[PDB]
Amino acid sequence: GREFGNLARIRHVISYSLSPFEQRAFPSYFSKGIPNVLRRTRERILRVAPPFVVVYLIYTWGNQEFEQSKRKNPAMYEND
Amino acid sequence: TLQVANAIIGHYDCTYGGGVHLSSPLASVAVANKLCQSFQTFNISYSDTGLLGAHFVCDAMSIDDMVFFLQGQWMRLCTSATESEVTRG
Numbered sequence: 645g646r647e648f649g650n651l652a653r654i655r656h657v658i659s660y661s662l663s664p665f666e667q668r669a670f671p672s673y674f675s676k677g678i679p680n681v682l683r684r685t686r687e688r689i690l691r692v693a694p695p696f697v698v699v700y701l702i703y704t705w706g707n708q709e710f711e712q713s714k715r716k717n718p719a720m721y722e723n724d
Numbered sequence: 725t726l727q728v729a730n731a732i733i734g735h736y737d738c739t740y741g742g743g744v745h746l747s748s749p750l751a752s753v754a755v756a757n758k759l760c761q762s763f764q765t766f767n768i769s770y771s772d773t774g775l776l777g778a779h780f781v782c783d784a785m786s787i788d789d790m791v792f793f794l795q796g797q798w799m800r801l802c803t804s805a806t807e808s809e810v811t812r813g
């Protein structure tokens with residue numbers, strides 16, 4: 645019922661493609677991969693990173709608070 | 725030789741009176757499955773180059789099947805050509 649031939653109505657659209665044996669599999673891989681990755685990470689880093697930053701701060705604070713919770717209070721054994 | 729190969733595949737359109745008894749297997753399967761409206765084979769030649777292939781006219785819901793059968797015929801001519809179809813071509 646839902647196969648190729650009856651998916652959508654498309655008019656006046658031209659597509660050009662070439663054979664995979666005709667073109668390279670890695671056309672300028674590093675020289676255009678690096679700026680594209682940098683663009684994607686600079687468009688998403690402010691939405692993604694600060695929650696995990698404050699997870700790191702909460703994790704370190706909780707671990708150190710537990711460590712000083714196990715620490716001996718020097719105020720005890722001071723009266724006698 | 726390539727022209728003989730085209731003569732094995734041949735041409736067809738919807739006004740042909742042969743019915744299902746056409747000698748071309750592509751034309752016979754097109755009549756049997758109501759796939760294409762027409763097809764033809766061409767060997768266009770230019771100075772040390774050219775285009776050798778097939779052009780077919782059909783509705784949308786048949787297209788892939790036509791391609792499949794057409795490619796099968798080409799591979800049959802690459803692998804399993806017999807003397808009778810060569811004599812006919």
Ligand SMILES: CCCCCCCCCCCCCCCCCC(=O)OC[C@H](COP(=O)(O)OCCN)OC(=O)CCCCCCCCCCCCCCCCC
Binds near residue numbers: 687688694695698702
């Ligand atoms: C006011 C924005 C100013 C931005 C200045 C930066 C320069 C902008 C112009 C140059 C372009 C730089 C690249 C742009 C990349 C995409 C755009 C972008 O980053 O937009 C800012 C982004 C979206 O802004 P918007 O959603 O409108 O802000 C609502 C804030 N709630 O908003 C953000 O990224 C802000 C995200 C802040 C998230 C704070 C979360 C704090 C709480 C975390 C709790 C986690 C759990 C804690 C523990 C719970 C249990 C104990």
